[PDB]
Amino acid sequence: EQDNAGDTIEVTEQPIDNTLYVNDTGSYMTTDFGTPISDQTSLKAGPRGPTLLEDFIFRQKLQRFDHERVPERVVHARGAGAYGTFKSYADWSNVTAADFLSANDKETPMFCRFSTVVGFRGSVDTARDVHGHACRFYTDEGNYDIVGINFAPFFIQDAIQFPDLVHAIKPMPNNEIPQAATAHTSAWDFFSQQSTALHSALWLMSGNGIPRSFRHMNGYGVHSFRFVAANGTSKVVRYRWKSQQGVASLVWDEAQAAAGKNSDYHRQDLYNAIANGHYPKYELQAQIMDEADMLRFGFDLLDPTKLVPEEVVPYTPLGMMELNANPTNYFAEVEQAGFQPGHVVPGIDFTDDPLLQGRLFSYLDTQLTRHGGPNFEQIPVNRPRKPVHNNNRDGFGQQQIPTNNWAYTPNSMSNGYPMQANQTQGHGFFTAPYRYASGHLVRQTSPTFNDHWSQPAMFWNSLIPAEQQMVVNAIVFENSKVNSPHVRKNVVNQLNMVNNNLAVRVARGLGLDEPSPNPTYYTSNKTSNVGTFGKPLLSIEGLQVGFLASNSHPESIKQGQAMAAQFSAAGVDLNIVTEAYADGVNTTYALSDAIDFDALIIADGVQSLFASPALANQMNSTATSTLYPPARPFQILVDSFRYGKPVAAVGSGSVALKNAGIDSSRSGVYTGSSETTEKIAKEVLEGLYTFRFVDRFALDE
């Protein structure tokens, strides 16, 4: 660049302020251009006069405000994030050249966001939905994102259908009803006309659609990807994030109650858990398969509507992630984060999964919408941990200052920088070299993709009877909300290709004719770890206990408080509830509901709070408590029991149980005198692990 005076360029770097995190301590307010200000009164022509155009303080403040909002994500708008770390279990170089997997105990920084799918930005956490599980590894060789969900299969087999699925499940276009729900004609029409959807539709109707929290679901990559070794050999892999807390879910009416009582239930759960030191963990696992396995198992590994059963190919544990810090600013870090499945690193490659292939286009393009311009990767949360060097330039919102004035390749002026990186130098990305294609250029679906029903059948067989009833109840609920009889009937006919018992039970729920067995795709096969009831949690850290006490019986508070040490030691929060705040009280009846607690304990001597609605109704007007709605304590109890949660009662607390028709002989009901509270606590710990007592759920066939 310097064989002459003209092309020789003097660089003078200016001492520009380079703040990242903003710290207000000690400061006076300034404009964005650094002039010290107050911001509390408009400049006016006299104190009762009109506001002046020259009040630039007013205009800069309101212009910022008027422009705060950005487009939400077209899908997964409602979500929450956290930072963490990932530790490799091994040097995996034998199967992948990926750097974050290259050594035992190698640690990589992480950022993840969890979300629903269909609802808009402020929709209810406990909507029935798919849930996103999207994690970025900030590796030494680039940001690697696994952008997954809590179900193993997806609804469709080609990315070109994605706007069809999404418009179908989103609110109707004429009136934007209903919010965050598939319970409408268009969605079930789509799922029944596009029968690839059945597998994921069953997942959605199961407890998987309504998880207890982000900490109590698994994550799946869904698609086949490739691990590529340094020498070019590849393996076909499928990812699972196995929650180290375990898998647990709500029941529908409980998910509804939670939506109305605490729309922030899952984001609050994640925030509180991290803030309280109960850091959620998920183990990265992969089914590591050979190229020869593409069609071996009787379905196609390119097909995203199909899971590989653990019993056919086991999951190999790769390493452990932990999320251990909350974001500092939600808008800056969470709202602006843009995950992309095309954010790959050397040692990872794609497959010809037609669903995956289109996602690679879509996510890069969509980042423009939400960020207003092309420099979205420059936002701090999206930056790689090492500095970027390439010949990309300019664009709205450019906050870097390139010094390489020869921004093209090949050139003879820049000393070869930046250098081309590839398989054999600079740890460059490379497509797996044995990949091959051969064929006409076709817009045709592979016939290997044609079985839409067998895997739905396996999934059904994989659920305990209580959760099978839950699926029926959900399908019946959603298809009763569907307004079109012909769609209802199409759904039944589709379900009958999956399992006759399922379809008959649904048709009965809908008041429709019962179909007859259609055995073509039926199977008795089943797989494990795809249900959400009947298997206990692996950790009860960060779960909640509600201890129902009264200010009118002061010893009840003290009884609550003496149990607190035991729960604290298990990482369980004990919440003492009374009518109103007082010494030792944590929360109140008026603020409380069953959904707020994972187990409930009734204190000794407070039985009189637990009047049934019928009793409440006699004495109305005067001398009924104003401090909470009529029969609130009773309702918390009855709801907790109905939902399947452990309930305990100390002393005369058992009177409350009887009032509620709860026999002390039921599973997950613990009783004891005031002298045995220590043992009652440990039984509650026991019940928290079991989590739900499914013997309480009504069964049909």
Q: Using CB under 6 A as the criterion, which residues of the chain lie in contact with ligand NAG when the complex forms?
A: 298, 420, 422-425, 454, 458, 523, 525, 573, 575, 584, 586
Angle at Cα 312 formed by Cα 431 and Cα 201, nearest 5°? 85
Active-site annotation holds for 199: no
Residue 521 annotated as binding site: no
49-86 burial: b if 16+ Cβ within 10 Å, else e? eeeeeeeebbebeeeeeeeeeeebbebbbbbbbbbbbb
Query: Contact residues for ligand HEM (CB under 6 A)?
Result: 62, 66, 73-76, 79, 113, 115, 132, 134, 147-149, 154, 159, 162, 222-223, 304, 337-339, 355, 358-359, 362-363, 366, 370
Q: Determine the residue type at 333.
A: E
CA 317 to chain centre: 22
- Is 1 among the residues that bind Cl ion (CB under 5 A)? no
Residue (411 or 612) nearer to a second copy, CB:
612
CA 675 to chain centre: 43
Q: Determine the residue type at 186.
A: S
Mind spelling out the 3-state secondary structure of 210-223?
A: CECCHHHCCEECCC
User: Least distance (Å) from a second copy to the CB of residue 296?
Assistant: 14
CA gap 462, 475 in Å, rounded: 17
Residue (358 or 536) nearer to ligand HEM, CB:
358
Q: Is 596 exposed, middle or buried (0-12, 13-18, 19+ CB in 10 A)?
A: buried
Phi, then psi, of 87 in degrees rounded to 5: -120, 125
**For residue 22, what are the contacts with CB-CB under 8 A and spacing of at least 6?**
none
Which residue stretch of 243-251, 346-354, 411-419, 527-535 sits at the interface with Cl ion (rule: CB under 5 A)?
Answer: 346-354
Q: How many Cβ atoms from other residues are within 10 Å of residue 461's Cβ? A: 15
User: Least distance (Å) from a second copy to the CB of residue 504?
Assistant: 13
- Is 291 among the residues that bind Cl ion (CB under 5 A)? no
Inter-CA distances, 677 with 356, 585, 657, 671, Å: 55, 19, 17, 9
User: Least distance (Å) from ligand NAG to the CB of residue 472?
Assistant: 21
Residue 424 interface partner, choices ligand HEM, ligand NAG, a second copy, none, CB cut-off 5-8 Å depending on type: ligand NAG
Residue 565 interface partner, choices Cl ion, a second copy, ligand NAG, none, CB cut-off 5-8 Å depending on type: none
- Is 677 among the residues that bind Cl ion (CB under 5 A)? no
CB 534 within 8 A of CB 206: no
What is the C-alpha R_g of the chain?
29
151-183 burial: b if 16+ Cβ within 10 Å, else e? bbbbbbbbbebbeebbebbbbeeeeeeeebbbb
Nearest Cα residue to 319 out of 101, 557, 476, 503: 101
Residue (74 or 464) nearer to ligand HEM, CB:
74
User: Least distance (Å) from ligand HEM to the CB of residue 149?
Assistant: 4
Residue 420 interface partner, choices Cl ion, ligand NAG, ligand HEM, none, CB cut-off 5-8 Å depending on type: ligand NAG
Sites for Cl ion among residues 349-378 (CB under 5 A): 351-352
Residue (317 or 509) nearer to a second copy, CB:
509
User: Least distance (Å) from a second copy to the CB of residue 233?
Assistant: 20
Nearest Cα residue to 223 out of 286, 298, 276, 174: 286
Residue (217 or 636) nearer to ligand NAG, CB:
636
CA gap 158, 379 in Å, rounded: 31
Residue (411 or 587) nearer to a second copy, CB:
587
Residue (26 or 439) nearer to Cl ion, CB:
439
Residue 304 interface partner, choices ligand HEM, ligand NAG, a second copy, none, CB cut-off 5-8 Å depending on type: ligand HEM
Angle of the 198-205 helix axis to the 465-481 helix axis, nearest 10: 110
Residue owning tokens 């009855």 = 638
Residue (117 or 502) nearer to ligand NAG, CB:
502
Residue 433 interface partner, choices a second copy, ligand NAG, Cl ion, none, CB cut-off 5-8 Å depending on type: none
Phi, then psi, of 574 in degrees rounded to 5: -95, 120
Encoding tokens for residue 575? 């919440």
- From the list 67, 76, 389, 486, the catalytic residue is 76
Q: How many Cβ atoms from other residues are within 10 Å of residue 518's Cβ? A: 15
User: Least distance (Å) from a second copy to the CB of residue 188?
Assistant: 15
User: Least distance (Å) from ligand NAG to the CB of residue 323?
Assistant: 21
User: Least distance (Å) from a second copy to the CB of residue 359?
Assistant: 9
Task: Point out the annotated binding site for heme.
Answer: 363
Task: Point out the annotated binding site.
Answer: 363
Q: Catalytic residues, which ones? A: 76
The residues of the shown chain that bind Cl ion, judged by CB under 5 A, are: 351-352
